[PDB]
Structure formats: C-alpha cells, structure tokens
Amino acid sequence: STKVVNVAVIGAGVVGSAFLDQLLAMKSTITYNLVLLAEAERSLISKDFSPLNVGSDWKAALAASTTKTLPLDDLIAHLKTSPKPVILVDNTSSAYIAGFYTKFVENGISIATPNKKAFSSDLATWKALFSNKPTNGFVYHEATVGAGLPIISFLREIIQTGDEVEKIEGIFSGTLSYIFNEFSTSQANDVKFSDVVKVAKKLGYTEPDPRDDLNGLDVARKVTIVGRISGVEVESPTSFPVQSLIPKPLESVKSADEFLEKLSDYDKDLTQLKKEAATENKVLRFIGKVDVATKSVSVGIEKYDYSHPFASLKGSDNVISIKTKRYTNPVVIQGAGAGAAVTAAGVLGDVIKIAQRL
Amino acid sequence: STKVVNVAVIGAGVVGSAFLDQLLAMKSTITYNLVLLAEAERSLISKDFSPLNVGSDWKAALAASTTKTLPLDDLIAHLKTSPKPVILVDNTSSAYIAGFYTKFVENGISIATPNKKAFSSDLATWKALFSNKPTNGFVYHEATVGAGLPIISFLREIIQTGDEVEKIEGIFSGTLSYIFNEFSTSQANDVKFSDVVKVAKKLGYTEPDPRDDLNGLDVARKVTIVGRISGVEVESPTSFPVQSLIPKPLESVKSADEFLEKLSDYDKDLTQLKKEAATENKVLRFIGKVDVATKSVSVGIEKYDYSHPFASLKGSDNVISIKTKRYTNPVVIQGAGAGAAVTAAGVLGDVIKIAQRL
Ligand SMILES: CC(C)c1cc(Sc2ccc(O)c(C(C)C)c2)ccc1O
Ligand SMILES: CC(C)c1cc(Sc2ccc(O)c(C(C)C)c2)ccc1O
C-alpha cells in the first residue's frame, strides 16, 4: 500500500494553527510526514526530507528555528525532488501564493487550500487546475466554501453521477450573517446598521477592517466557485451584481477607526429598507445566489419570511440550499461557516481525501 | 495513475436500475468496467473480465440471457481472478447476500452498496468489514443513511480529523418523514394518521404492507449505523428503545388490508398527541437519536417546536443533526433521503470514491 506521503505546510495563523494541532494528534492508518513548516520568514524545512523534530510543539520550535523562509519559485523546485507523494496546505489568504497554484500542480505537488483567490480569480486559471492531465497534482478546497462543511465535496460528486444543478441560495458569510441576523430580526427592533457593525468589530467578528467584509467580496468569490462547479461560466468575482454595504463615499475614509464613526451617517437607508421590510412581514439577510438556468449570479440583501429557516440562524452559521434536478426539494446544509478548528478540520479532512488517492 | 477498476453489480430492481443507467452515462476521468450484472437468475457475467459490450437498454440484455447467476460462495471464489482490484455494487437488501460481505473484504473485494443489512447485524460482523486489513476490500454505504446526502463520509471524516460526535439526531425514514410531514404541520391540520398512511400506501411511498414501515425497523437500523460510527457499541437494531408506530392489536392481523381498515381505530391516540402540540407551538416527528456521552440510542416520537427546522420539512426529506466537540453549533444536513436517482447516485458516487483508491 501507499502509507508514505510527505506534506508541506505554509501558514500557521489560525486555521493554520488548528490544522497543525490536528494533523499530528490525528491518529490514522496512513502516515503523514510534515517535511516543512514555513511561516512568514521563520520556517522549519527538512532537507533530509523526513518527518520533522517539532512534535506537538511547533510554537517556538518554528520561532527559535534559525531558518529563513524558502523562496516560492525555489520551493516548487525543492519538492520536485521529494521522497514519496507530497502535499501542500496553504493556510493563507495571499493571492501571491495561489497565483502560483499552476506551478505547484504542474509539478505533481498536491494542494488542499481554504484560500479562494485561485478558485475565484481567473477563469482560465480554473480550466487547468482541474484538467484531466494525470501528471499534475490534486487540488481540494472544501474549506473555501463549506468550511468544515462538505459543499464542494458533495456538489462535484452529485454532478458526475449526472445530476444537474439549477439554483443555489445561501448565507456564505459569517460576518454578514451575524450582522444581519442581529440588525434585522422577527422581533422587530430599530438597531442601526452602524452600531451593529461597530459591536461586531468590537467582538472581532469582522476583519480588522470591516470593509473587507462589507463589500461582498468574500461572498462574491465563494459564489463564483460554487457557481463554476455548478456549471456556470463566471468570468470573475465581479462579473455579476454584488451589493456592497460600504457607503459609496466612505470607501477610503482615512483609517478603519475613521470609518466606523463615519459610517453612522448612512443608516437612514438600510433602516428605511428594514422598516419597509416589516410591512411585507420580512427579515433582512445577505445571501449568495446562482441560478444555473439563466446563468444569473448575484450577491446582496434578500428578504426572507419568518417561517423560512434562514430567518432562524444562530451565531455565525453558513446555510446553503441546493435545488437540483433530482433534488426538486432543495438540500439544505447549514453549520459553522467559520472557525479555527471547524475550518482546519475541513482542510485536514481534505488532505486525507488526497492521501487515499495518491 | 489507476483509472482501471472492475465492478460487479448485483440487483437491478429500482435503485439498481437507476444505478446502472447512471454508471454508464457517467462521463468521468476514471474508467469503470462492469464485469458482471447478476439479477435473480438471469445474469451477465464476463469470464474474460472484458467489459459488457452492450450499451443502453441493458435491461433486455440481462432479462434475455442464459448464464445462470453464479453462487455467492462461488463468486468471491471467482472474482479474485480479477486483473484489477474489484468492487461490489449490491443494489439489494437481503440478510443473505449481506451476510457475505466480510467474505468479500477478507479476500480483497471492495463493496459499494445501499444495503442497510451487513451494517446492522451485530458488533462482530461489523468489525470484520472495517478492520483496515491490508489486502482487505473497501466498504462504502452512503446510500444506507439519508440516501445521497453526505452522512457517512462527513462523519468518517470530521472524526478522522479528530472530531468526537457528541449527539447525532434526525429523521431517517423516507416514508415516516413523508407521513409526518403531512400529519403534523405548522398550521393545526386535521388529517387522521391512518389517512395520510393509506395515501402513502396508494402512491407507493410505503411498502405493500405499511406495517413494515411503522415498526421503526428501518430507522432503528439507520441509527445503529450512525451510532456505531459515532462511537457507541450498539449490539443490534433492537438493542434499544424503538417505538413501533403499529398499534399493539393490529400487529397480529394477517390481511395487509384488515390492518389498514382498522388503523383508523387508533387515530385518536396519535391525534391527541398532535393536539397536545398546542404546547406552545409544536409538531410531531419520528426521529433517530444517538447520545454518545451516555451511550444512549433510541428511535421514536419526539415533539419539536414550530420554529425548529424539523417542523418545516417538505416532501419526504431526511434531516440529521450532528452536534460535536468542534461543532458545538450542530451541523444540520437535510435533503432527499429516498429516491431512485438520488439513492443510486449516492452509490455511484461511492463506487467512484473506491476506484480512486484502488
Ligand atoms: C480565504 C479568505 C477569504 C480569508 C478567510 C478567513 S476565515 C473567514 C471565513 C469566512 C468569513 O466569513 C470570514 C469573515 C470574518 C471575513 C473569515 C480569514 C482571512 C481570509 O483572507
Ligand atoms: C436497505 C433497506 C432498508 C431497503 C431500502 C429501500 S429504499 C428506502 C430508503 C429509505 C426509506 O425510508 C424507505 C422506506 C420507504 C421503507 C425505503 C428499499 C428496500 C429495502 O429493503
């Protein structure tokens, strides 16, 4: 059998931190050798190309380590000549790394990233990373959308069997759900958008700069990936309507802290829109949407009815519906769409789905 | 790479019929060779292991045949001669054929099936299948719980990464789901239990004798499998409380019809319960339940609140919740738990997950 496979791990911020914690404490039949741990500059490469000497203590092990991080164009090279099968676990968000997902794979290297960029960026950078050339490596990103959830894992499959997708309506953003779930409820309140997003940054539910969340970017990217998988030819994460929540003016408003106290001047709209929603007996939710038929993708504010499940999401859960040919009655998968462990696990689970194939 | 894998298909009633229709029209990167199609007596074996040059309408190729289905004690003693690894697609459910699986694995045969049998005998026959024996065969059965829905996998996964299922709960029966989704609704309906039951019988949603569905048997079996996966040592599908929806009296009647013509005499019993659902705002559902902690499994009638998602299931959908260590906020997967295509696809998808490993 093939229980010998070497793995390279880049990034160890959060989901990267949990990914490692799990990768080792992960008792399994197969054997995973972490041949290199390269964070920022301080790395932990293994020239010898055999399991490292860090164990469940990579914290300072990588810290101390008088090793400077290897250059990417040189990393793909280092690996071309490696013991047994190799894997890559890009725990980052950098577009610089994914920008080179072609080289890694074109060079057999396998990957399992939660980073969208490559899968949401170019459209020809997708019509290759998934070609049928058996010489290149594997790419698994289940954590790019579902996170710990099996959305991509499930769609791909149902597809080959022969099912055809039609629509995909869902809550793909932790931040925006938390925000909307609190701003618009069935109890009916008049909380301002400003205050909610504020409070949401205070608890660290948004990015250091909320803007990176409010512009629909993230969702827009996630939908693009799903939509593509589904069978729609989406050119880019901007090739369709994406309703940003960043006041037309305020997109550059000095600092981020200079955006919060400034944003407060534009709630008069969403509130009016929230109240009006009330007349129709509706709540406000930020959703993604892909309608295969009309090839129409779009992300923005959609108002759902109370009875509707969406209007009943706790915490920051991502919920996605998949109405297909066979599943006339849409399949609804909902759960933690964010989270250190939750997310890494989707990654670790991915790596596993690879090892079994190599 | 390994794009060469031979498959054996036993049974072609319904989900077996769709499974084949799909297995072929299934354009894929890998190559699946149907080395033998054995239904009842008329089979379509392939001595030279070369594929089954037929194409479509294979139904007339299997019916109109001469080669007699080779015994199960003589098939495992034949297939081994296979050049490439082997797979077994048992699109049936007989506590006979099932009781032969380990006799396939221990010899190197892989199994992909919708059969809930072998995975519900006793905690012995089970271990024999998932014993990670070197040359052993692969055992996959996603269509055994929630049909196409990703239950098993998603469970063998998060756990294989380091998750500890804490509490598994859901509605696992197609018919029962359908039945209750119709009998206990948000708006205090007025349907007599036995009426949505005959209506079930009339549309072929239930078995010829509705009792075989009201005994909880099916659910009890599905829970057992999930519970086992979860980590509980369940001896049998009867080793715990399973509330048969079949009156005590009516169990004895012979006539499948006298049972139905009499089921109306026990409608009130179940009707008051639905009225007692004035309790705040609740609906009635037949659920499965596994509480790892206290090793307590059980299947029966549980009353849920209106707001609760379960109290909002359409058609005959199976919904299952999985509250774990990392997923404090339970992961809820719901979709078509029955269906010809839907189910076969879970099987075909399974076969695929195998080929990639052989
Ligand atoms: C891959 C990329 C989108 C990314 C993900 C995460 S984790 C992550 C996943 C989902 C989600 O709704 C959010 C919000 C808070 C921005 C963060 C952190 C940084 C980051 O750059
Ligand atoms: C494997 C076994 C349980 C089985 C499954 C099916 S398909 C199937 C799957 C789920 C479900 O709730 C039901 C009800 C109608 C009995 C049937 C048909 C025959 C059969 O013997």
PDB file of C-alpha atoms in Angstrom, chain B residues 173 175-176 179-180 193-194 196-198 200-202 205-220 242-264 266 286:
ATOM      1  CA  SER B 173     -37.084   7.358   7.191  1.00  0.00           C
ATOM      2  CA  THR B 175     -41.989   7.184   4.343  1.00  0.00           C
ATOM      3  CA  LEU B 176     -42.192   8.118   8.010  1.00  0.00           C
ATOM      4  CA  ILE B 179     -46.122  10.659   6.646  1.00  0.00           C
ATOM      5  CA  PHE B 180     -45.423  13.046   9.485  1.00  0.00           C
ATOM      6  CA  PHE B 193     -52.903   9.422  10.887  1.00  0.00           C
ATOM      7  CA  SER B 194     -54.214   6.382   9.035  1.00  0.00           C
ATOM      8  CA  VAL B 196     -52.032  10.063   5.320  1.00  0.00           C
ATOM      9  CA  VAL B 197     -50.981   6.460   5.832  1.00  0.00           C
ATOM     10  CA  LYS B 198     -53.305   4.966   3.187  1.00  0.00           C
ATOM     11  CA  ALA B 200     -48.855   6.901   1.470  1.00  0.00           C
ATOM     12  CA  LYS B 201     -49.722   3.318   0.573  1.00  0.00           C
ATOM     13  CA  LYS B 202     -51.680   4.387  -2.505  1.00  0.00           C
ATOM     14  CA  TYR B 205     -44.425   5.631  -0.810  1.00  0.00           C
ATOM     15  CA  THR B 206     -44.930   2.804   1.715  1.00  0.00           C
ATOM     16  CA  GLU B 207     -44.187  -0.897   1.283  1.00  0.00           C
ATOM     17  CA  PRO B 208     -47.073  -3.138   0.182  1.00  0.00           C
ATOM     18  CA  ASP B 209     -47.782  -3.631   3.909  1.00  0.00           C
ATOM     19  CA  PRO B 210     -47.394  -0.226   5.702  1.00  0.00           C
ATOM     20  CA  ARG B 211     -46.516  -2.091   8.901  1.00  0.00           C
ATOM     21  CA  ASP B 212     -43.035  -2.992   7.621  1.00  0.00           C
ATOM     22  CA  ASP B 213     -42.550   0.777   7.756  1.00  0.00           C
ATOM     23  CA  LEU B 214     -44.264   1.642  11.021  1.00  0.00           C
ATOM     24  CA  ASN B 215     -42.219  -0.849  13.043  1.00  0.00           C
ATOM     25  CA  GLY B 216     -39.354   1.641  13.268  1.00  0.00           C
ATOM     26  CA  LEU B 217     -37.150  -1.151  11.871  1.00  0.00           C
ATOM     27  CA  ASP B 218     -35.642   0.980   9.066  1.00  0.00           C
ATOM     28  CA  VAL B 219     -34.895   3.958  11.310  1.00  0.00           C
ATOM     29  CA  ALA B 220     -33.654   1.683  14.097  1.00  0.00           C
ATOM     30  CA  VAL B 242     -37.758   1.693  19.148  1.00  0.00           C
ATOM     31  CA  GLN B 243     -41.369   2.833  19.328  1.00  0.00           C
ATOM     32  CA  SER B 244     -43.338   0.897  16.714  1.00  0.00           C
ATOM     33  CA  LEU B 245     -45.979   3.156  15.175  1.00  0.00           C
ATOM     34  CA  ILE B 246     -48.005  -0.025  14.719  1.00  0.00           C
ATOM     35  CA  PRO B 247     -50.805  -0.401  17.274  1.00  0.00           C
ATOM     36  CA  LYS B 248     -50.312  -3.342  19.636  1.00  0.00           C
ATOM     37  CA  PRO B 249     -53.541  -5.035  18.496  1.00  0.00           C
ATOM     38  CA  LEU B 250     -53.024  -4.618  14.731  1.00  0.00           C
ATOM     39  CA  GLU B 251     -49.634  -6.369  14.806  1.00  0.00           C
ATOM     40  CA  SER B 252     -51.467  -9.706  14.677  1.00  0.00           C
ATOM     41  CA  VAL B 253     -53.952  -9.235  11.814  1.00  0.00           C
ATOM     42  CA  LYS B 254     -52.992 -11.189   8.684  1.00  0.00           C
ATOM     43  CA  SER B 255     -54.610  -9.171   5.921  1.00  0.00           C
ATOM     44  CA  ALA B 256     -52.440  -6.208   4.993  1.00  0.00           C
ATOM     45  CA  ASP B 257     -55.829  -4.715   4.278  1.00  0.00           C
ATOM     46  CA  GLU B 258     -57.544  -5.512   7.598  1.00  0.00           C
ATOM     47  CA  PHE B 259     -54.677  -3.702   9.271  1.00  0.00           C
ATOM     48  CA  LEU B 260     -55.301  -0.583   7.216  1.00  0.00           C
ATOM     49  CA  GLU B 261     -59.096  -0.843   7.544  1.00  0.00           C
ATOM     50  CA  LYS B 262     -58.521  -0.968  11.306  1.00  0.00           C
ATOM     51  CA  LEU B 263     -55.699   1.538  11.709  1.00  0.00           C
ATOM     52  CA  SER B 264     -58.415   4.204  11.940  1.00  0.00           C
ATOM     53  CA  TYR B 266     -56.147   4.113  16.836  1.00  0.00           C
ATOM     54  CA  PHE B 286     -40.422  10.309  14.199  1.00  0.00           C
TER      55      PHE B 286
END
